Amino acid sequence: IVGGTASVRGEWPWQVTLHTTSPTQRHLCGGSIIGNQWILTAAHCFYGVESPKILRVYSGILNQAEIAEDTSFFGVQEIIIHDQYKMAESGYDIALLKLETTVNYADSQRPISLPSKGDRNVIYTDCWVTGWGYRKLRDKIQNTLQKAKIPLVTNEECQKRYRGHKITHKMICAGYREGGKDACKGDSGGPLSCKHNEVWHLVGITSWGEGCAQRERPGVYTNVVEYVDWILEKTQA
Numbered sequence: 001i002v003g004g005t006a007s008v009r010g011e012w013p014w015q016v017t018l019h020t021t022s023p024t025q026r027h028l029c030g031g032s033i034i035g036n037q038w039i040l041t042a043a044h045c046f047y048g049v050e051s052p053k054i055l056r057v058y059s060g061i062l063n064q065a066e067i068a069e070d071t072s073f074f075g076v077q078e079i080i081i082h083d084q085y086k087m088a089e090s091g092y093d094i095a096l097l098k099l100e101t102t103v104n105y106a107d108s109q110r111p112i113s114l115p116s117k118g119d120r121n122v123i124y125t126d127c128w129v130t131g132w133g134y135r136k137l138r139d140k141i142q143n144t145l146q147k148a149k150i151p152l153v154t155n156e157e158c159q160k161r162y163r164g165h166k167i168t169h170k171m172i173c174a175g176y177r178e179g180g181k182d183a184c185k186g187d188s189g190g191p192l193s194c195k196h197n198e199v200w201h202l203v204g205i206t207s208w209g210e211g212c213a214q215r216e217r218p219g220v221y222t223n224v225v226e227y228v229d230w231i232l233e234k235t236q237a
């Protein structure tokens with residue numbers, strides 16, 4: 001997260017830090033708890049991941065320093081990638097992680113409500129992107145969970161900033177026309193949370209962008225509401 005600040009413990013209880021143990025353990029991507037056994041994240045996070053066995057999900061985490069060899073974690077039983085996904089910039093950058101065990105909710109770890117199709121007309125004015133990603137470019141994973149408030153931008157306006165891409169209705173962008181605040185490497189898969197009527201919604205999933213926090217280069221996120229049907233179908237035993 002570029003241009004953000006340190007988060008408060010338990011402030012983003014749905015945020016998880018997804019790690020890979022190969023070759024040696026490290027943060028790989030962000031993710032959001034959406035069910036007692038489900039994490040919603042980005043599909044491009046699993047490039048090269050041949051098996052869910054090397055994945056480890058950590059919830060109720062603020063600082064990466066909290067994570068040690070003796071720290072409890074959730075194993076991944078199954079990785080579910082949307083069957084139409086090819087690459088982040090093409091859309092369909094969404095994936096589900098079925099945990100080997102159930103998450104016991106608490107103030108430090110609880111789910112985030114998915115957006116309702118009857119909210120597409122709703123205009124979010126209080127959205128934040130969070131993560132342990134780079135603060136600058138060519139940097140490194142941060143210790144403390146960073147947060148940054150970022151206004152959404154219309155797709156028509158986003159399309160203007162990405163003339164070489166096709167910004168579909170399954171994508172949603174956010175950023176300041178002057179840059180400065182934005183998601184960056186390591187923030188992938190994390191949530192874009194908007195607070196509407198005292199309730200938090202998982203509006204988007206950090207997917208891609210051009211560089212980090214550049215002027216006239218809004219971050220691009222998966223438009224979660226466009227996938228509630230997909231999510232139901234895939235999480236229904």
Ligand SMILES: *[B@@]1(C2=[C][C]=C([C]([C][N]C([N])=[N])OC(=O)C3=[C][C]=[C]N=[C]3)[C]=[C]2)O[C][C]([C][O])O1
Binds near residue numbers: 028185187188
């Ligand atoms: B992801 C991941 C997250 C962010 C980025 C960013 C784009 N973000 C944005 N502007 N909203 O791009 C870079 O940081 C970047 C791009 C090109 C050259 N240098 C840096 C990219 C990727 O987080 C984990 C990673 C795993 O695949 O994906």
